[PDB]
Symmetry: D3
Subunit: 134 residues, 6 copies
């Protein structure tokens, strides 16, 4: 089966300058119906196709897939190749994780954080999805 | 089930300088067999791992997943961090969408468009795929 | 069903300066249980979310999905937009392939290679996965 | 998926002397979750392994699988080979039906009726089940 | 998935006095779409809930599930407990078989034959079905 | 998926005169691969299409589906309509059960027992099968 959530915050863009990971609002999957099911697994893709980051010390952004049981299932990020890019170019980002559904998991969700004092931005379509299989 | 199409236009590369979205030839999925099926959903991934864009005003490229019912299911793109990059570097791009198969859909396909008068280029492997589940 | 492998080589990073494709250790899928099954197909995603490449001639990195039957199912890569980037920025990369399981396949795996004498680096989470369906 | 209901009325046996079909209490399947799903079908088995019928004019019993939309999906029955059997022997009975789940169906259930004024009896395990597939 | 066929020959009943197995018309499954698929198996149920047999030497009827490759996957039958039953009572019959779909099979079908010169009769609902799984 | 076992003891028929349930040799399903899986269920059919029973006090036979955890999932049987049938006619028998695979189950199997001092006989094809679903 498929579980899916997307956002498209054109009118009210998202940003973070947080050094710690914080939730990306709207990018959460409810997997309660499948929990406590050791024979099931979720393959989870976080797709942030058009992010950027502003800043003045080799800016970038980090992303993670986590559960509400404190498991960091995957992480990664982008950075620029200059200290102060004259344009914060759009840097497509995708991240793929796996999680057994054996445990009492309820939520699989996206988080983000900054790098070197940057501000990370999302102002367009992004998604999180899972394929759940036996 | 899986539906899949790929291209690999090494000998005859693809390009667009179109401001409006136009089809990427060869990156189309036929989902007719699954249409009018409200209990089915497709999770669709467009993978353009090695595109670039030429131009002189912060060039880039945009991509979309659409149906032949006029639904834009997802969009995003890449841009460079300089006004006139001395090399149009390869900027891997992936985009993930979801579509209920309730409607009379026949085709799910990839489109692209330019940015600020750029020319977008594909000269190597790219794919579009879907997982269809109940 | 889902098949999955990941790495997270923070303490002992990976690198290659190989012009020919070589295996990324740890990014291998065992599909033996599904082989010789013409009604089955694998949809395979290689996710390298945080690679970079060092070098002095427009550096970058290439990646491929292959089988142990010599099939190159997909390939692509990233490159920088400068001859000698002052920072080798992190360039998220994903690649999606399809393979019929009709043949006597045992292994689907990731490979990488350099570009123009670069060194490609992985020092954090990366994965390879497949959805196997009828 | 599987939907299932059984009864085992040892302490309070069931009987009917009804000429018209009437519900067998407890032998009902709730298929509401799957309704309005044209791509789904149910394969339904009614298993009455140990019924009998009393009477004096070639007794027997009839059974049917029906929906709450007035569809009689299957029917059949047993009869004895004598006008007045000296023992109403146990006559195992099974019945298999198919139903598309396209419609607004809620319930698939078992019914029974008599033959030639008989009384039909169930005093032990019986079941109704469905396999639901795409 | 489910494959299914039924008959309900109330207006034009079926009979056989054949000593050799012959096809029951209408009780045939087309499995061509699944053939040459070693990872698939069919679980096949033949349900004849209300047959009888006439005759004067301990009459009965035999049934079989066969393919068009000459495989007899299952067989069985009913007989009466008297030499000349005064009423040929209805004797519910079900038969379950399994078949790998590895081979070039096209058809799985029902057959019947007599016993000791009997005539076997079907004048009401009967079905043949399969569940096909990986 | 399907699990299946059959017997066809033409050359060396089976019989029991046991008052207690005893295993029918060969009619056992190994479900170990699916055990400890609360999201999975088995729908189990025992098909004895051509049994009979000998004896002189309203003979018959009983059958059950059991696990190796002492669960009697289903039971039923046939009996004749005379005290001493002049021919022990063939009395087709089918029995359907359901079992959650949550527990540490290894085996689902068929048992039989006599009635009123009868001897129950199987000298031809019989099967036990399960459909296992999520
Ligand atoms: Na939840
Ligand atoms: Na189409
Ligand atoms: Na292998
Ligand atoms: Na209902
Ligand atoms: Na055919
Ligand atoms: Na076992």
């Amino acid at each position: 089966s498929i579980v899916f959530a997307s956002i498209d915050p054109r009118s009210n863009p998202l940003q973070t300058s947080s050094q710690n990971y914080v939730d990306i609002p709207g990018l959460k999957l409810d997997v309660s119906k499948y929990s406590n099911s050791p024979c099931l697994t979720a393959l989870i893709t976080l797709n942030i196709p058009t992010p950027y980051a502003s800043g003045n010390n080799f800016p970038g952004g980090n992303f993670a897939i986590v559960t509400d049981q404190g498991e960091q299932l995957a992480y990664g990020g982008f950075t620029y190749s200059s200290k102060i890019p004259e344009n914060s170019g759009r840097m497509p980002f995708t991240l793929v994780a796996r999680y057994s559904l054996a445990s009492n998991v309820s939520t699989i969700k996206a988080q983000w954080s900054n790098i070197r004092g940057s501000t990370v931005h999302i102002d367009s379509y992004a998604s999180i999805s899972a394929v759940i299989q036996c």
